[PDB]
Structures are given as structure tokens and as C-alpha cells.
């Protein structure tokens, strides 16, 4: 339960499934048919996000880590923040949302706090 839930990815529906049997926990969206499987090892993830409670729609994100371009500002100042490569999953259940929210958030943060 607290690792998966029916999500939608690339215009097709399925389940999102976080697996910790493996090397650093990976999130796996697999279509309802099971043909499409996309695995995201959470160690490569920097953040994760979800739809605000004001919005009815259900969404999670996987914010993958970025280039070390978090480096200091440019000679022209620029003031740059490196654009993250992220994933977005559509659900239609708040319980799933909150669980997937928590599941991803915590494991990600386990790699951050590292305790």
C-alpha cells in the first residue's frame, strides 16, 4: 500500500510503485497493462512535489538532480538556478497522493539526512 498507487504517465494509465528491495529505492510507473515500466532510482532525485490542496487534481513529481551548475553566479551576474529534470504522475486518489508523497519524500530525504 504505502509504496504504490494507480498513476498516469505519458497519456497512459497505470500504477506508480516504489521499490526498496533493490539498490537505492526506485520508483516504478507501470501502465495498467504492465507493458510500460519506468523506474526511477531515488538516489538520483533531488526533490519531489505534489499538487496543492487548493487544486482538486492529483499529481506527484520526481525532481531529479541537476548538474553541479548550482555553482556560483556568472561574470555577467546572471543569477542562475539549474533547471531540474523532473517527472510528473497523475493520480485520482488523495490517499495514494499522500502515501506516494510521503514514500518518495522520506526515502529521498533518507539519502539527504543519510541516517
Amino acid at each position: 500500500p504505502s509504496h504504490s498507487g494507480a498513476a498516469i504517465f505519458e497519456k497512459v494509465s497505470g500504477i506508480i510503485a516504489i521499490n526498496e528491495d533493490v539498490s537505492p529505492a526506485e520508483l516504478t510507473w507501470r501502465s495498467t497493462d504492465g507493458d510500460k515500466v519506468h523506474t526511477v532510482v531515488l538516489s538520483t532525485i533531488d526533490k519531489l512535489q505534489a499538487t496543492p490542496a487548493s487544486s482538486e487534481k492529483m499529481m506527484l513529481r520526481l525532481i531529479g538532480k541537476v548538474d553541479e551548475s548550482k555553482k556560483r553566479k556568472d561574470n555577467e551576474g546572471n543569477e542562475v538556478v539549474p533547471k531540474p529534470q523532473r517527472h510528473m504522475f497523475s493520480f485520482n486518489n488523495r490517499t495514494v497522493m499522500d502515501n506516494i508523497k510521503m514514500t518518495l519524500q522520506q526515502i529521498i530525504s533518507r539519502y539527504k539526512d543519510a541516517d
Partner: peptide, 19 residues
């Protein structure tokens, strides 16, 4: 084209709360 709006509505919904 569509994914582009997906990052828009996320901020739009955020700017709603950030009034």
C-alpha cells in the same frame, strides 16, 4: 506544447495562494 502548460498551471495555482 502540453507539458509546457503543466509547469504553468503549477505556478498559476501557487500564485493563487501567494496573493
Amino acid at each position: 506544447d502540453t507539458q509546457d502548460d503543466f509547469l504553468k498551471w503549477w505556478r498559476s495555482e501557487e500564485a493563487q495562494d501567494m496573493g
